[PDB]
């Protein structure tokens, strides 16, 4: 996250770290046994780490649970990043409480102008690299379909939205991928892609979760 603030330990109780020996992507807990992330984060051998604030230090609230199954969206296209979403089933159900909690799925798509909270342990610089050990947060508005398409001509599909600031300086970045964009207490987006981080006229692009709610519910109902 570039130009955000320190969230505070366990203030984002649905935030997940995906670990394969090191943190490589975020995710969101949507019920005690399922995590949603970006399909471009797919890897074999994932361990889900819940209750994290400092990812390099055991502070007492975490639960580490291995994934038993990963299901990438049937139409994920790795070249265009269309349908960049995947579900991960946990080997055991997590124990939910105030500090690790699930986020609910949306009943409606959020509109442009809605303020959201984006979080993750990704890079904090737009030039150079510095990975924080504690969770970072950014409040940012969903941008209009038109400004999003003008910033990325010929690349935005109906399954994507832009969020952030056209003047730059504040954005999600590498390592934040797969993480949550929550607006009005509901998961509306997944950190998916962008051109650099925090550059002028290149806002972050996010998977539009409201288009996938039927696929998520049907899939978790039979797996
Ligand atoms: P994420 O993996 O942390 C990163 N996206 C990623 O690199 O995959 C998509 C991609 C591939 C090749 C070039 C560009 C993008 C990511 C997530 C968000 C932003 C952002 N500026 N908001 C940037 C990179
Ligand atoms: Ca920790």
UniProtKB/Swiss-Prot annotation:
InterPro entries: Peptidase_S1_PA (IPR009003), Peptidase_S1_PA_chymotrypsin (IPR043504), Peptidase_S1A (IPR001314), Serine_Proteases_S1 (IPR050127), Trypsin_dom (IPR001254), TRYPSIN_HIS (IPR018114), TRYPSIN_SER (IPR033116). Interacts with SERPINA1. This is Serine protease 1. SMART domains: Tryp_SPc. It catalyses: Preferential cleavage: Arg-|-Xaa, Lys-|-Xaa. Gene3D superfamilies: Trypsin-like serine proteases. Its EC number is 3.4.21.4. Ca(2+) binds at residues 52, 54, 57, 62. Substrate binds at residues 171-172, 174-175, 177. Coiled coil: none annotated. Binds 1 Ca(2+) ion per subunit. Keywords: Calcium, Digestion, Disulfide bond, Hydrolase, Metal-binding, Protease, Secreted, Serine protease, Signal, Zymogen. PROSITE patterns: TRYPSIN_DOM (PS50240), TRYPSIN_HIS (PS00134), TRYPSIN_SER (PS00135). It is found in: Secreted, Extracellular space. It comes from Bos taurus. Disulfide bonds join 7-137, 25-41, 109-210, 116-183, 148-162, 173-197.
């Amino acid at each position: 996250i570039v130009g955000g603030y320190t969230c505070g330990a366990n203030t984002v109780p649905y935030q997940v770290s995906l670990n394969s020996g090191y943190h490589f992507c975020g995710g969101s807990l949507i019920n005690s046994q399922w995590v949603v992330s970006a399909a471009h984060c797919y890897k074999s051998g994932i361990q889900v780490r819940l209750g994290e604030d400092n990812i390099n230090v055991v502070e007492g609230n975490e639960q580490f649970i291995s994934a038993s199954k990963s299901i990438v969206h049937p139409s994920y296209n790795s070249n265009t990043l269309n349908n960049d979403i995947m579900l991960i089933k946990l080997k055991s159900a997590a124990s939910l409480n105030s500090r690790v909690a699930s986020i609910s799925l949306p009943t409606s798509c959020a509109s442009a102008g809605t303020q959201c909270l984006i979080s993750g342990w990704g890079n904090t610089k737009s030039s150079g690299t510095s990975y924080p050990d504690v969770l970072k947060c950014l409040k940012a508005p969903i941008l209009s379909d038109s400004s999003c398409k003008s910033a990325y001509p010929g690349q935005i599909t109906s399954n994507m939205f832009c969020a952030g600031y056209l003047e730059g300086g504040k954005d999600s970045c590498q390592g934040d991928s797969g993480g949550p964009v929550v607006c009005s207490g509901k998961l509306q987006g997944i950190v998916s892609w962008g051109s650099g981080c925090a550059q002028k006229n290149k806002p972050g692009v996010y998977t539009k979760v409201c288009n996938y709610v039927s696929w998520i519910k049907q899939t978790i109902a039979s797996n």
